Amino acid sequence: ADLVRVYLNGIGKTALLNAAGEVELAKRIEAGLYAEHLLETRKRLGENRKRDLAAVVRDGEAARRHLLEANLRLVVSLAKRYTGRGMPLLDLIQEGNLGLIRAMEKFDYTKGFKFSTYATWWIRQAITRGMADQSRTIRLPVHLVEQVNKLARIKREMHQHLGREATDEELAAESGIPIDKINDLLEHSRDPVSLDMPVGSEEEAPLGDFIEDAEAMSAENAVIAELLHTDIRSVLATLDEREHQVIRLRFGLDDGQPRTLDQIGKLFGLSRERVRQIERDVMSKLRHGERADRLRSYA
């Protein structure tokens, strides 16, 4: 068992790389990439050099694997510090490994800097992105995640200085965030409760048992929808047909997009001021005759 242990032994299988080794591998891999690039541009393809170029490509790929295997230890050394934050340790290591391959994809040895310094930033970036996207069941935007962490860090520091928990207003002054924004941000920070948790030890009944559906009365909805929608359509039909079109466009009974007074006037060629009177006529008509008898309910 202990899937962490088996992976730790696997990474420990490869030995560390020295500066001379790192530069040599970097040169080999770069040549392999250049050789692979040359494959698609040698229109007058050579015969023996083609096999030699392919061999170098395999060598470059071998160097890439060896470099990654050696450098996996850095990833683990960086992923260890983020544990206990809603993401399994081994999951963090895999996210960091994704960062490692991404960093290696853009690594450059011409600057003469050790690979560790350049990789650490990417490993950090990849792990923190992973945690933001995955750690929460209800995926929040990365912007919100960064803001939540900012507030949590500020709250800790302010509380230590004050010696007592600070209010939203005090946090707003410290963090320069609107008070309402802080309240909303705090609500987002909440981790949802689990329904399987027994409640009050009430006959070992999970909290989900007591949840009330209290919705989805399909039979009631269908009859009401049929009656009301048909009644309004028929009543509008009994009115002037052009006014029926006006209601559909002014509102969007068919295509949404409730047309404003000026807009509907433009479509019908009328003025913005005529629509108010048209609506006044429609409402007056709708409150008299059989229209009232049908529509007296539904209110």
Binding site: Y7, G10, I11, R64, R65, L68, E69, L72, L90, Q94, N97, I101
Partner: peptide, 10 residues
């Protein structure tokens, strides 16, 4: 992507 064998195995 084409990660090494150890990565895919893990």
């Amino acid at each position: 992507l084409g990660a090494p064998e150890i990565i895919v195995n893990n």
